[model samples]
Target: AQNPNCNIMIFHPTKEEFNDFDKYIAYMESQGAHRAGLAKIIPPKEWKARETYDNISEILIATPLQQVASGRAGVFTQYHKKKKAMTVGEYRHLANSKKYQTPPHQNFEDLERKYWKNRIYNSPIYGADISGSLFDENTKQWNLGHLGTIQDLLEKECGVVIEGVNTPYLYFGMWKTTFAWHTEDMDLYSINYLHLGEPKTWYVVPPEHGQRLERLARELFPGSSRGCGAFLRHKVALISPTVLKENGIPFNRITQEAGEFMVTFPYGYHAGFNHGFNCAEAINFATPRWIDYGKMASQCSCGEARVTFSMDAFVRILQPERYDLWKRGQD
Candidate 1:
């Protein structure tokens, strides 16, 4: 058996290039970077490398991470079980300790089987406000909502600002915490910014090959994702890169570190795990290209009871006159 590693072609842009936002994004799309399903952008040398974000030790992460039964040969894990909860401070404490740092397989041949038996994955804080988030307020310009190129066009229509969609969410990750194979809601684009701490590993299949990946998951899980297309959001499955290759599905790999961004394209299927305690902020965004994807997303079943906002309303608000131009490109 031959094992291969897939490397991601990252975009390095100076603040000047990155500042042009939509223009630079069009340049990237022209280069066909989005076909990879996922790509990253790194700030240029002169751009601020490390940023000090706000402290989040006090905010309570609503949900807790579950123990993973299915383990990857290394950092990947799935089939979350049990339930776990600890403040950012305490989780950060064990996250740096050699004991918690010890991976499941690092149990030294089952000698310390019980050591591998605990559920220590800390849950990400979801639907958080930007002001109170780990994102530094000074970096407001590039924050998801304010970005010129990609932004959440489908914002709350009523009086309130939408969380996670129009607004942003925070993920306070610890070693081995997993986000299983899934696409962004409403099939829109998403940007994830790792504020600080250790890196995260990502595995993404091309948008075109997304069906092949889906079929494989359906075959393995059988019972679930059948009734619901968004079942992956349940965070129950972990399909490894080796499995992808064994199934003849190509995948792109990316290591998302502090002070960088990861963009998952429309309908892109992706999965990943944390290398250590890390703070990340993410939000869903859409270009005119995502309009139809958002329409199809409304048809997605089961898990999605209701859409966060109306896609129909977003069209006129976004660019009422250019709908045909955007529609032609949708092909």
Candidate 2:
């Protein structure tokens, strides 16, 4: 697919224009732009990337390292992997290190097969929420948040603190660290801003191809697909881009530089890998139109261990006046 047919939108907006992101999202949807599944917002150069780890550089976190399995390129999950706890400074050192970039294994692939088996593939600080750890990392100017406030039809009536949802989660990425294909929880929209560091490359597939991607996941990773309908949500699977293209799945690629914002539309699938070191904050938000998508995602299951988040509570709070009417038929 080409520009007007399948690519994601890239908007270069001035400071004033970036305030109300919800409006632009609606505009994209109205223009049938969600087919690209994602969009990139490059704010004016005046907006700069902030250094998140500098203020508190020695913070200790159980940041995991990733390795890619050879031949097929399947990323090994935690079940078959090892963990190494690293300080924020140490990981940053590695992501920006001159030694790790070359020598022994060389480039991404050779190093990707560490121990000649569990190859060194990534450097990542999972996700720490932005409250206590990040003092100045908020995106107030971008009008992006979990909509815990009244940004949508339901917000004025309800408010809740969903840590990883409305509250932003900060991530540290280095080298070829990757985020596998997945939609936001509750299928809400998402916007991630690279607060500082290197560019991240995002591969997006429109909402139209969402289910198709799921089907491919089921057939490709048969064992993981057995019972979970939202198997990709596990965040452990990564299909090579070459494979995605060969299968005829339409996708758009975007390189998000520091200080830029990447938006994922409702139900639009997205995955990406870091070019080097970067600190990005991501949070979900919704518009009136997202109600249907959120409700649709609500249909899948119960159980403490397998639970993600309850969709019904969100709907009830979002539309209390019509809760009785909506819940009876929908729930």
Candidate 3:
């Protein structure tokens, strides 16, 4: 069976109108468009190509979370590991040092503050006031420092128990941009929330060099009207096939809609373009939980596994009491 009409869809068009993805994203600056409601899958293609869900698993009838995990976790999760230290500051340094575009210093403070205090349109909280919050390193189960608390609240609020940690305040650890692209990490059904900024433009490729991103979409969730799997064509104006193939996803284009929100249903084989041109201040948040695995055997895979230290090493490093406080969630 196909998924029925969405539970809800809110369209505030006058609040969001622009000539292109570029101008639209730029409008976020003045509109202060933050906070988006639940994820909403866009219009169905209603077009068929060489593939169909005939042989694939039925995803729509089943819970999306279950479908993705059972299908893809085995093939993808094989390579979940930490790489280098990847922080926003570090990324800025690299971009600036290498002149990737413009220097990051001028915008660094504001960028950080925007994400930190991202409550503006993010809802439950208003304005960009997310101070003292943990900085996320990708997945939530791995870290628990700043963004860790937010992760905990989401889990508690949504009734989703993370499969990874227990250290509470012990948010997961992360590395820099050099992180690997594991197969188990890709899947549909994840809760992707874009809270700020002009929409970002992205472009994605397959897991390996030039792999078809759409080809694997169906594999992420079969019979769910959500995939195209292998053979899905790449979009226009892409600069990083290597990144997409390695990262397991692509950044195509973010329309930078002010107060406008777009949700990519599970296994949507799409990427962004326009690079970083969206003028809308940008912030993104989501619960990439393994709602279901079986639906995503098509896609591939978080973190931990560096710093040759254990409880003893942790004790040797920080105030044992402080470490204990962090470990117990009372920190």
Candidate 4:
């Protein structure tokens, strides 16, 4: 085989979903990589409304600044547009503080619930512009979009949930906001949808090649003994596809257009950058197949489980109807 299965399967609403948009939406909401393919969905609606940056200035003006203690919930700024590195903190600190003169177009307000609930989701900055399989119970009743996804159904039926990480991570990326090469936590599946923006380019390395890439990183970066750990300590590193391609490691490149969703399979390593300003949503979910990976990931070298979920407990909580459906090989 000249080309391996590294490329993502592109599915336009009509081209792949029996010419039915509803069917295409339904397919994404279901679990399993089904057919061993990473999926890229282009919804029928262009979702033009979510594209405009008209209200960002207003929201920035209205929201008062406070120190963000948690690294996970804050605005992140990159030193160079093309470089993969960032400092996470309050946007106000980066934007107005005398000590930090935030570079133009470098600061991005991450989707912290405080912002998303009060401002981001309602404002032009994100309204109707972002959609994905993030399991939000508040919207599940009325939102037809991805309401029935595996994550949603599992939480509703079994009460197994991880707050903060399970919900969508909304990104308001300006030119050069980048996520470095990393797999989802516990090798779970992740779906990222670009609600509206300039195209976001992705570089994906198959799970089989991920370790080699990590080894190559250690070799390339001096004083890096633990492969991926070096980059993790540094916050980010420019592990672009070109370097991997030159090293004989194949990669698949895709530029996600507006209204498109990119799904990353279990253990798949992917990294990407925003071409320009964009709003995107990303969420994680595990299929039945992910159970093994979850168990393995929970075990550490120290022989203690880092994050353990009791399947026994889960079974006790799972609704009878859901258990029956799961037994029948249905989502």
Candidate 5:
């Protein structure tokens, strides 16, 4: 069967305009949550990307609970020991040290810039962990993206209690820091906001063909389907969009620039890498549509299961508030 229509959308909304959910409600209502949209926000003329980066870096360094990861891609996970978590200050110095040799660039400054630009750093500690709190005052300055909005609305309207799962995952990446092909937990929607940085390229496999991609992946990497396997590694077992297309599986591509947002659907299998040093925040959200998938995903055993909420729980809680809407087929 063909997948539902999903678009990779881009919107250039003013800072004020973007905050209004109604402006981009259509993208959220789209059938396939795998949609990618960019909100090109134009701030005041004095706002600078470099300054934002500097501010975020300073906050991260001062925050002691922050965990920084070093590695290529999925190395940050348990499957690979290559990625290690350290203090933000150490990682910042290491990244800017220019110790790792790379292709020649314009000058020493260029090299240093590129060095920091491409280092993969994770967990800069930005938002609350479900209590509507923050690691520091600076993180409070960070704007909440669609995920934050969705979670907040659900909690407010439906009496939804989002604990651990509601927190956003922060990622800092430089060149070639990649995320392997995977879907959000329980097929829930994911919204990634590029706070500031270079562009990040994304490749996606639509929900309808996700099974096909998995089957092909199993054929190519025998043990990948069982659990965390070679395919999840950095630069090791990436199944490219070109390969999927060749195999008759559908996919799409997009490059998320700074100050843009990328939304992923429940069944959207996506993977991408940062073009340069960039800061991005991602969090999963579940709407009424995710009820079935979330139920099934809740019973499954996977690494992500430990990290996210049981969508089934959210659905049950929201049933009372959403009963009329569900009956009216408003999901």
Candidate 6:
């Protein structure tokens, strides 16, 4: 299928299809505590969920992403998450602007400096540097020297292969989104889907700056931002191939009755809004056969926490079989 950079290709489930997945969907809706756009069609809900619903409506009619939130929502996910909830001030410094009155993460520079050297990382067999035979500790998980071996597996097994695995999954949940925004990251060919709730997305961007922006941020601040820096705080949510059949808005409506989503990874940024408190329980399903895919490892860019996990680490924490598969995937 051809890819559309600006719009999402929605595949809605038929009544029959919905019935087939009803059980799993119902359980997720309960866990997420969310709402639905059925309210959009029903007048009672419009009056009740007016606040949350209106924003979504406006997005559909006017105000594309660049005009919304001063164009910051795409990158700055850590800052945005804190800002929207008005909860944590832990990394408040990262936020500098206030077009959306995002909670103050103003001191991000200082926080970056204080914690940039910290990292949580893992390297399985793909990137190991092994020259001679015997299995050396440093070469424990390197397959033929780079990630090419792993990439080969992705090409052969999974439907897609994305370059950025270290990115934090922010927009995956269906909770109160801080504000509406968009990003250039969505341009990456691996990102399969992009959705919009409201505010009329006028423009979109490319994934050109992801690594460059992160590198520059750390270089300028030296000890700040770490490798966690991003131009947009969020990656577009990839709607699974199943959800593609739905009509109108591609994603299942985020409702208190039905708000759980089996979200795809490597998404692009688009537009979003809510009437009350929009919440969504998001599930990501990608096989992580290598250590770099696990989120617990220390990020090497900032040097804050050390999370260099071993195959043994996985066995200690998880099952030995999973580890064995991870090892065999290299071949």
lDDT of each: 0.61, 0.62, 0.26, 0.46, 0.49, 0.24
Name the candidate, 2 or 3, with the larger TM-score value.
2
Candidate number achieving the greatest lDDT relative to the actual structure: 2
Tell me model 5's lDDT, rounded to 2 decimals: 0.49
Find the number of clashing residue pairs for candidate 2. 3
Give the 10-residue window scoring lowest on summed lDDT in candidate 6.
Answer: 119-128
Q: What is the alpha-carbon lDDT for the whole of candidate 1?
A: 0.61
Best TM-score among the predictions, by candidate number: 2
Residue-wise C-alpha lDDT for candidate 3, range 90-172, written one tens digit per residue:
33233334323222334433432342232122111011112122224442221222122323433654564433321211011
Q: Could you tell me which residue pairs clash in candidate 1?
A: none
Worst 10 residues of 3 by lDDT: 60-69
lDDT of 2 by residue, 104-141 (tens): 54654444334223223433433233332243445455
Model 1 lDDT tens row, 1-331 = 1112323448988767866666766676766777888879987766552363455676655555544454434223354343455666766776677754635444222312322233323333221223224544565345554653223344422232332325667777766566778887557788888888877788898877788887887776766756665556455577666567788987877678888888888888898767667878887777767766655542333433333443334433444564444334332
Each candidate's number of clashing pairs is 0, 3, 94, 1, 6, 75
| Clash-forming residue pairs, model 5 | 33-265, 34-265, 117-277, 118-174, 118-175, 187-266
Estimate the TM-score of every prediction.
0.72, 0.74, 0.28, 0.54, 0.61, 0.28
TM-score-sorted candidate list, best first: 2, 1, 5, 4, 6, 3
Cα lDDT, model 6, residue 160? 47
User: Cα-based RMSD of the predictions, in order?
Assistant: 8.1, 6.0, 20.0, 12.0, 9.0, 19.1
Q: What is the lDDT of residue 161 in candidate 2?
A: 41
